[PDB]
Amino acid sequence: MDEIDLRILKILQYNAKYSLDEIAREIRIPKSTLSYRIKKLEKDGVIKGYYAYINPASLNLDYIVITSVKAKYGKNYHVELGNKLAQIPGVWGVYFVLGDNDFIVMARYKTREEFMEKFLERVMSIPEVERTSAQVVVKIIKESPNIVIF
Amino acid sequence: MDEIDLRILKILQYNAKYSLDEIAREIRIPKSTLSYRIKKLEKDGVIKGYYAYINPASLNLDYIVITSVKAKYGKNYHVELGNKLAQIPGVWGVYFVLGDNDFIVMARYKTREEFMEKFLERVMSIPEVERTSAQVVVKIIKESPNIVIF
Amino acid sequence: MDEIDLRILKILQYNAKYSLDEIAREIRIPKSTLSYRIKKLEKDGVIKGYYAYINPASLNLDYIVITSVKAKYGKNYHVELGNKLAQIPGVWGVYFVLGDNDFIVMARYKTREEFMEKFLERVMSIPEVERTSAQVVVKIIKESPNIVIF
Amino acid sequence: MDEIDLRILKILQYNAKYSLDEIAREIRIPKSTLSYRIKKLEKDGVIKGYYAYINPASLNLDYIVITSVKAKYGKNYHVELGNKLAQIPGVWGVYFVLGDNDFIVMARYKTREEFMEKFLERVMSIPEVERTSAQVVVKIIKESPNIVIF
Amino acid sequence: MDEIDLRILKILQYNAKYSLDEIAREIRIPKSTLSYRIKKLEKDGVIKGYYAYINPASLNLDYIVITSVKAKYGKNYHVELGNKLAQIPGVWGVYFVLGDNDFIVMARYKTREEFMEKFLERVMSIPEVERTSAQVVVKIIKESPNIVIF
Amino acid sequence: MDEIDLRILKILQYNAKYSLDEIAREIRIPKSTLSYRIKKLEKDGVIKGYYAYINPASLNLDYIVITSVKAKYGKNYHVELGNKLAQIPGVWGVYFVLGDNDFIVMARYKTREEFMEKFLERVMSIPEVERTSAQVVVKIIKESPNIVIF
Amino acid sequence: MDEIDLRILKILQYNAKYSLDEIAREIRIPKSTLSYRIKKLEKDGVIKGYYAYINPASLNLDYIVITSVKAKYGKNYHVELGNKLAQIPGVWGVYFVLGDNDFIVMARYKTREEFMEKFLERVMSIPEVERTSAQVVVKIIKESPNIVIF
Amino acid sequence: MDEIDLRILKILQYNAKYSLDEIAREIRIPKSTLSYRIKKLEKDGVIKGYYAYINPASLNLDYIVITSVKAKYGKNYHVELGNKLAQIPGVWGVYFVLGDNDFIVMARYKTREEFMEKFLERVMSIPEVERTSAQVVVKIIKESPNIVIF
Numbered sequence A, B, C, D, E, F, G, H: 001m002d003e004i005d006l007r008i009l010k011i012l013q014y015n016a017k018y019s020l021d022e023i024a025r026e027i028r029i030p031k032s033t034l035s036y037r038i039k040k041l042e043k044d045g046v047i048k049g050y051y052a053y054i055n056p057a058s059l060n061l062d063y064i065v066i067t068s069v070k071a072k073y074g075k076n077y078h079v080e081l082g083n084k085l086a087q088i089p090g091v092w093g094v095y096f097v098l099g100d101n102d103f104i105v106m107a108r109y110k111t112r113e114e115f116m117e118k119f120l121e122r123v124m125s126i127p128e129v130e131r132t133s134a135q136v137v138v139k140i141i142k143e144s145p146n147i148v149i150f
């Protein structure tokens, strides 16, 4: 990867729906070269794919909660818990964090009931779970994980 | 939005690079109808855009940290802090959470030095900040914010 | 329910001992209509009943305590604990709260001894209880759960 | 107050809509005596009034939250804060608790927005407030403050 | 007990080595009456005994520590733990406290080694103990438990 | 101080009301020697005095509370706070503890009101106080500060 | 040990590579005496040895972490855990601390992966471990354990 | 640096008092080469110096404490505090840690008094200090910061 690639990625991370011609005219290089560079970035896994950015509000994903999970030490219990947490519907992010030493889980649902039935009641029964603490999001000031190049 | 739209969105949230023909053959509807439905979803803001999903590791975004920020009460100091946090380079997520009552900040950097210079040292000088606590991510089990339809 | 009902409920939540005539003269509607509307609110369960508001001090309910209960995760142990907590004499409120993720219990007794014997010693032996923390109320600034319409 | 009064209060705390005749037949005393005893209990302030018990769900009071408030020490700042908290719409209970040494606030709203606008944003600007912590109620197992005699 | 008794107790709590004549001349009553009143206070257990107040420093009781003990819930485990804590040499005070809901233990030793061997290592092996936290006293500003009448 | 002194102190810490003859017969030494040794222990300040041990219950000292006080750093504010805490009526013990780094205050009162008026409301107004936390004693398992020799 | 020894130790703790002649000229004593005094300090174990001070940065020891370990009470489990912690590669310091009552572990590694594999994953499986909390060092302001004489 | 250097450093970190001949015979290389390699390691700053390892117990460094310091946010106040902490006599280690976000201070003294006078009372007056918490070391299981190569 060279500086040309960064300029390309810095544009695609925002809008992957530009024409090659428009991107070409912006970074000043042949469309054949641009097209070539994009293809290989994909091949080398720098670009893992293209997604449609859907507004969660539009799906009534109103009940947003960030949960901290403390796991029961022993083996084993740890990684095992990470994977059980990641397969719960509505959970889009699971992180093993230092600190505190436990898991941070990002999940979205339409209502309280849904959250309770799909997330809460389910996590309550997992064996390897010592204790959890939820932090309800009342306001999203920013959420742009797509922006990796500042 | 009807069930047909959900089927469309459930595919686009994964791969927005399918051909209309392939999506049409999958959900069984005229390409003209599919194309029409997608265009309006965009118009109604359900689909806010299309992004290239870039692998953070490929950019050496190694120092991942989740920071909790406690703000000084008064006015005012609150929203003000949210916006100052959101404009810091490397910060992609800022949430005002209940709970705890404070802000959860998601940020990525290549190294410790970068994190310290771009995030730490900067947050340390913000007036409205009472105290912060960082939780270093040592392992990402899952990160797919693009998946809104389970 | 319409605005007329709200005006009625806003009065009954305070004093259910007014005459229909007095309420009628206040909201300007036939007593037969008022009487009809009240009867159906009761039928539809909006009005669950009428209670006498008794001053707790008059019964020497001096030892007021708000207890937080952390439950042992597994199944099951959760709901089970909620119900065991709710049947303890002197306990009038039990809430499953997010946050913290555990139960908030409101209880009143005449003395410390009573509290210890009826609440403390009993909760100490419940299997599903991990740990509890009590917050003694030294002053009630306000307690009007009857007011649902502000 | 004698044991006869307790039997009366133990019934009125449940249903203040019984006929004097029915209560009389239950506790075995002249209706004139019963009527007399009730009148004086009211006079001596044991019975402060009669309320209609309204189902909060019926009013869409969905966003229930228990907030802990830590106050800035000095004077003065304390009682002052108690009263400012008690006059906020939606707040039905405010307690000064030992423990922890701070205030426990019970409040109900229809939604998150309402809670934020009526409670959150307002408490954030109060001078005497050091910090707050909210515990969202996801389930009410029991709420019968009307029951003072077990 | 009357006001005369309080005047007597208020003197004896300080110095039980005054002559009856000197106390008599101070509160203005016959020595026979004073002597009589003291004898009965002892009989009724108001005065449980007379002790020599020994300076702990003089015994090299240098390592003073206040320990909080969290007990494992179940039965039973509670009171049982209180008594095991009270029989440990060097422990002069054990309190079951609300709050926090656990035990506060006051203990004095000559050195760190002694504290570790007599208290620490011993408490570490008690079954009913969940966890403990010690607060080392680096300065005694006041310690006059003998003063009950202010 | 020699072993003979310890034997003497070990008896006086319990009951200072024994006759010299009885103590003499117990440790096997001339009454003149015993009397001499006691006199000098007093002179050297090993024995600071003799007190009457009064049962706190007998004075209705029912509201027992152990308070932790966090002080505002600066100078100065520290020692200053220790002394202000020690002169509050009902406070018999004040300790500066490591740990936690703050003050542990032992106080007794007859009721909640007294505690609030004499202790609470007073500490709330002290400038150098950052925050406090009270732990209500619901049971005294042991309180024998008079025993310094085990 | 006398003041002459302190002067010697105060120099050797800094630079053990001075010539005896240079140290002799500094403290003003015969080289034979100096040499004699050093030899015996070593014999009496005051001087346990001479080490080369290696810069950790030069070995890419970048991931520095201070971990707090809470142990499961019972016996036994305690000391046992101390020794298991001390034999983990990369761990140079293990302390049993009061306070908090648990272990403080100092460890250094080159990267996050190394830390996770050599420390984290290993501690996660130790039976006697209740829970741990890591504090990542982002800046070493000072680290001179070699300086014992100030 | 090559593997030969590591073998050399791995020996010098333990005992810098071996003869070049003995080290040469161990790693199998000419003494002239060994001597050359050591000289340059020193020049490149890999080896910063040679110290005498002094037993702290031998100096009666009995009062060992690990203190956590929370600093007042603003500027500036941060680094400033780090340096003020590092110049306090008895303090050998100061670390700025993530986590928690504050400073970890390692200090040793002979007694409690010394600790209070040299460390405590001094830190209490520093302006930029919000609060501190001390963890008394009652047992050093391991302390070998000199070992950088495992």
Ligand SMILES: NC(=O)CC[C@H](N)C(=O)O
Binding pocket: A020, A021, A024, A029, A030, A031, A032, A033
């Ligand atoms: N986009 C462009 O201008 C490139 C045109 C074409 N790829 C070429 O050969 O230059």
Ligand SMILES: NC(=O)CC[C@H](N)C(=O)O
Binding pocket: B020, B021, B024, B029, B030, B031, B032, B033
């Ligand atoms: N994709 C399709 O088969 C649709 C074809 C075209 N839109 C039509 O008129 O049917």
Ligand SMILES: NC(=O)CC[C@H](N)C(=O)O
Binding pocket: C020, C021, C024, C029, C030, C031, C032, C033
């Ligand atoms: N309260 C009233 O005035 C109503 C009277 C009666 N219900 C009617 O027919 O109007």
Ligand SMILES: NC(=O)CC[C@H](N)C(=O)O
Binding pocket: D020, D021, D024, D029, D030, D031, D032, D033
């Ligand atoms: N409720 C009753 O039976 C009482 C009747 C009436 N008060 C009487 O004189 O007895």
Ligand SMILES: NC(=O)CC[C@H](N)C(=O)O
Binding pocket: E020, E021, E024, E029, E030, E031, E032, E033
């Ligand atoms: N102390 C006194 O003066 C009392 C003297 C004696 N008890 C009497 O009969 O008065």
Ligand SMILES: NC(=O)CC[C@H](N)C(=O)O
Binding pocket: F020, F021, F024, F029, F030, F031, F032, F033
């Ligand atoms: N208590 C005694 O027996 C001592 C008596 C007296 N002091 C003596 O000269 O021995």
Ligand SMILES: NC(=O)CC[C@H](N)C(=O)O
Binding pocket: G020, G021, G024, G029, G030, G031, G032, G033
């Ligand atoms: N370093 C010195 O000057 C000491 C010399 C030699 N040890 C002597 O006999 O004095």
Ligand SMILES: NC(=O)CC[C@H](N)C(=O)O
Binding pocket: H020, H021, H024, H029, H030, H031, H032, H033
């Ligand atoms: N230590 C050794 O054997 C090395 C000897 C000498 N440096 C040489 O020329 O080989």
Ligand SMILES: [Mg+2]
Binding pocket: A051, A053, A146, B051, B052, B053, B146
């Ligand atoms: Mg994307």
Ligand SMILES: [Mg+2]
Binding pocket: C051, C053, C146, D051, D052, D053, D146
């Ligand atoms: Mg009611």
Ligand SMILES: [Mg+2]
Binding pocket: E051, E053, E146, F051, F052, F053, F146
């Ligand atoms: Mg006494």
Ligand SMILES: [Mg+2]
Binding pocket: G051, G053, G146, H051, H052, H053, H146
């Ligand atoms: Mg060294």
